[PDB]
């Protein structure tokens, strides 16, 4: 995830 920074 790009928001979360991590996990894609």
Same mark, same amino acid.
């Given at each position: 995830?790009?928001i979360? =920074?991590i996990l =894609?």
């Amino acid at each position: 995830s790009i928001i979360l =920074g991590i996990l =894609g």
